[PDB]
Design a protein around this ligand. Structure first.
Ligand SMILES: CCOc1ccc(CC(=O)O)cc1
Ligand SMILES: CCOc1ccc(CC(=O)O)cc1
Length: 119
């Protein structure tokens, strides 16, 4: 029932994401020189270094907030892709499936710890 355990669990999950090849297009903010119309379609850019830095700065209060920002990386990729068969969008779908598979226990354990605290 460790209320703070989600933080290190999220740091480890971000390490796994950074290690895999599929994360390369999403590790740093999108390069507007590579994609000049990016901010005409995407309102809020997000990338894994910004998520990691926000976590390390102590600027997430819960794993749900981290999960919302990681989900925004994937929804931005889906909104920007000209095709659902594109290379970069295909990488985002694989990364999203891996992320969701692992974040589920982080969220469940955190919410369980809070309930135990408020029992
Ligand atoms: C991380 C930058 O985000 C993306 C860049 C390009 C595409 C679309 C494409 O294949 O050109 C999809 C997402
Ligand atoms: C032990 C870590 O194993 C994996 C890591 C990342 C992915 C996600 C992806 O490659 O897109 C899948 C499996």
């Amino acid at each position: 029932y460790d209320i703070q355990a989600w933080k290190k669990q999220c740091e480890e999950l971000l390490n796994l994401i950074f290690q895999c090849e599929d994360s390369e297009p999403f590790r740093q903010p999108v390069d507007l020189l590579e994609y000049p119309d990016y901010r005409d379609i995407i309102d809020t850019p997000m990338d894994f270094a910004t998520v990691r830095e926000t976590l390390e700065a102590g600027n997430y209060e819960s794993p749900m907030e981290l999960c919302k920002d990681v989900r925004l990386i994937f929804s931005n990729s889906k909104a920007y892709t000209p095709s659902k068969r594109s290379r970069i969008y295909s990488m985002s779908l694989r990364l999203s499936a891996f992320f969701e598979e692992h974040i589920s226990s982080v969220l469940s354990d955190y919410k369980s710890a809070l309930r135990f605290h408020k029992r």
